[PDB]
Amino acid sequence: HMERASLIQKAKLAEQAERYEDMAAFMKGAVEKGEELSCEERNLLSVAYKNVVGGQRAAWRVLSSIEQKSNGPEVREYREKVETELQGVCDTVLGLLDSHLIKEAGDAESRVFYLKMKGDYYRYLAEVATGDDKKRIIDSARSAYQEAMDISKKEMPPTNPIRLGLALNFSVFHYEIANSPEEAISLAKTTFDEAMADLHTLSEDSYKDSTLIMQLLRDNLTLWT
């Protein structure tokens, strides 16, 4: 049973069983059916790949930290193996975004969501890349986040959680990847202040969603300043 609805049901079962590689492979199959994803389906795709790449990123940081603290060939070789696997997962997500998810039609929410995801997966590639390849990947991540920022400022209110989450991640990109802390701090401050001005005009459910991301923006500002 591998019709589109069966693949989504299997992704939900894999999520309950904490089998994120299975969940990501089921969501990849569902995306390749060619139909748009609902908000619930987008979240399933995002959670699945975030867990997969999150485990590889965590392993890479443990290895990189051992490799640096020691300053044998084993740590380097094993770190390269984890890197190659992480790169394969990012290339798969970037491939899905290019061939199926990123399009001209659809609401601003879906367009910003996928463009933000494109910036995020290029940012994960940038974390492990070196030399000229790293420079090109950094410029590719910036272009995707910038295109998403332009849409969100024109078509979404400043309290929209997708708009807030994009600014949070683009601010992290500026700070850690692009080495532009001034741009990182000013983007997080501006995003926080513009949302703060409109928070009183939201319902309890929306207020809860916006303030949760606003706390993360504040937490990063407290850490960096």
Binding site: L168, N169, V172, Y175, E176, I213, N220, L223
Partner: peptide
């Protein structure tokens, strides 16, 4: 104590 990116 560690920077935040979106939980999704």
């Amino acid at each position: 104590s560690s920077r935040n990116s979106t939980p999704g």
